[PDB]
Design a protein around this nucleic acid. Structure first.
Lengths: 54, 93, 109, 119, 44
RNA sequence: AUGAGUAGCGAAAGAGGGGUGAGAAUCCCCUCCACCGAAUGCCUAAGGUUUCCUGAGGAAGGCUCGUCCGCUCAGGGUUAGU
RNA sequence: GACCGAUAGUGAACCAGUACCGUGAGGGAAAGGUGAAAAGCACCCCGGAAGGGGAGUGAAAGAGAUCCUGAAACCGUGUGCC
């Protein structure tokens, strides 16, 4: 229940390969496009199917 | 010894002090070893008015933190005198 | 080719590299949208320093912002605050509060 | 099935009751996405009871709709508003009186938010 | 779960006080030792 | 440094509408809802020592956040012949 | 003074028998260096502020407030060969 030996740098760096985050799924709005999220109402001018709700 | 001007030190000017002063009451700071009777006589002699009652109270010191050092301020004693209705008013400027 | 630094903003460097990896190499206009659509905690700070770099390029060198791309986007580490937390049976383990330096360089493509 | 929303069976009922009573008064709310998705069903069921318009109906709805004032200067109970205005407003639609519109996350804990309103 | 220290000013002054320590010769020895070292708080 | 972005975050019911703000799940107001009631109510010992009241603050402390605080800075506040 | 030169020399080159620990007798630390002279960054720009980029002072600003020189462990960015 206690590590037998210390961990080197190669093993640490190898294990961290999948610890990362991806880009968001985003697209611009037809009116005053501001590169909002897909299937969401934008907060400045990404007017979802009409007016810009917020 | 025990001159009367040695008992009174300085007047007190706050909002509470002026509110009380509206009703012929006056607030002073007095020597820490003087009882109410010397305060009464001293007020009578210095200003020449009529005194009815005196109330007295003690205060402790406060801790301050100027810089990286610490200390304490000095103790105080406060008196509130009430003149009679006929006596003139003391010209506290 | 202007730059901008943060210098001892209170955040653990390992958690800021996670976003600075995302932002590096892209084009300046696209960069801000990704930065303010990401839900992490270092995104507002990185966005502020990037805006400062763009403004430096605009005023001091008259370089225009329709071409800029991000060239250097590293994160360093700064001084540490050491605290304590009492455990069971009088033990008092140790706690670290880390800091970081943030640097961004913008260049004309 | 349904969702438990992280509460016990007796607090879930109270929270649903509070939400369905506030939606009637304010005509649009904003909560989390899961709460809205679990709320739309109950709110639609309540509307239909009102559209019927009888004494049994009135009494059934009464045993769920919280009693708060819905219009000042009119001493209008929320139940009276439900049986007066909405029933005439949607007298011709066959279901679907609600719509959900998503927004961005929340700063405090990253929860996704949504606005639910009456159409 | 009573702890070993229960504060009280009267007992403290009656046992560890200056006026108490100045009664025997051993208390005066203690005071002299404290003065020689240079402590700010003599007795209690 | 490693273990590792891992274990933990210390008994308990909240929801919405306003507000303020550079910024609000966490601060103020309102309305419903919930808990104690031989106490989780009030008054007051020992002990503590300014922690009390008002106006500003956002470095450090609050096991998160914070426009808030028993935190920081300035002013004030304790009246006896019974 | 063929004595020490900041882990050395007094426990103490610095508001030291101090801070802390103990009911008490008692035990007992860490912490030096901007520049010859503050000449200690008017003004402009980003930012709520902190912090920066210019412009200035200076022989030097990579000298800008724990501000002479600044090694190693430790943490990163780019790239030639696998």
């Amino acid at each position: 229940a206690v590590p037998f030996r210390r961990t080197s740098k190669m093993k640490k760096r190898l294990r961290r390969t999948h610890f990362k985050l991806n880009v968001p799924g985003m697209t611009e709005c037809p009116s005053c496009g501001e590169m909002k999220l897909s299937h969401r109402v934008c907060k400045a001018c990404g007017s979802y199917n009409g007016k810009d709700i917020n | 010894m025990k001159d009367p001007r040695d008992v009174l030190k300085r007047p007190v000017i706050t909002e509470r002090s002026a509110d009380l002063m509206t009703e012929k009451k006056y607030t002073f700071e007095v020597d820490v070893r003087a009882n109410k009777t010397e305060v009464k006589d001293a007020v009578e002699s210095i200003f020449g008015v009529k005194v009815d009652k005196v109330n007295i109270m003690n205060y402790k010191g406060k801790s301050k933190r100027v810089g990286r050092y610490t200390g304490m301020t000095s103790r105080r004693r406060k008196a509130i005198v009430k003149l009679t209705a006929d006596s003139k008013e003391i010209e506290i400027f | 080719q202007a730059k901008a630094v943060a210098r001892t903003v209170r955040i653990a460097p390992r958690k800021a590299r996670l976003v600075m990896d995302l932002i590096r190499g892209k084009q300046v206009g696209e960069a801000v949208s990704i930065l303010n659509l990401t839900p992490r905690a270092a995104s507002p700070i990185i966005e502020k320093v990037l805006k400062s770099a763009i403004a430096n390029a605009e005023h001091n060198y008259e370089m225009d912002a329709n071409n800029l791309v991000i060239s250097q986007a590293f994160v360093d580490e700064g001084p540490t605050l050491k605290r304590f937390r009492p455990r069971a049976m009088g033990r008092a383990s140790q706690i670290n509060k880390r800091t970081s330096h943030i640097t961004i360089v913008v260049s004309e493509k | 099935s349904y969702r438990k929303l992280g509460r016990t069976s007796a607090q879930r009922k109270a929270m649903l009751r509070d939400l369905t009573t506030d939606l009637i008064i304010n005509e649009r709310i904003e909560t989390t996405e899961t709460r809205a998705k679990e709320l739309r069903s109950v709110v639609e069921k309540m509307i239909t009871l009102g559209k019927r318009g009888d004494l049994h109906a009135r009494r059934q709805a009464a045993a769920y709709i919280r009693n708060e004032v819905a219009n000042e200067e009119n001493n209008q109970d929320a139940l009276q508003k439900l049986f007066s205005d909405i029933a005439t407003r949607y007298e011709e639609r066959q279901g679907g009186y609600t719509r959900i519109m998503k927004l961005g996350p929340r700063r405090g804990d990253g929860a996704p938010m949504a606005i639910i309103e009456l159409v | 779960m009573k702890r070993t220290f229960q504060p009280n000013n009267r007992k403290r002054s009656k046992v560890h006080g200056f006026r108490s320590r100045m009664s025997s010769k051993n208390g005066r020895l203690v005071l002299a030792r404290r003065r020689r070292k240079g402590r700010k708080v003599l007795s209690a």
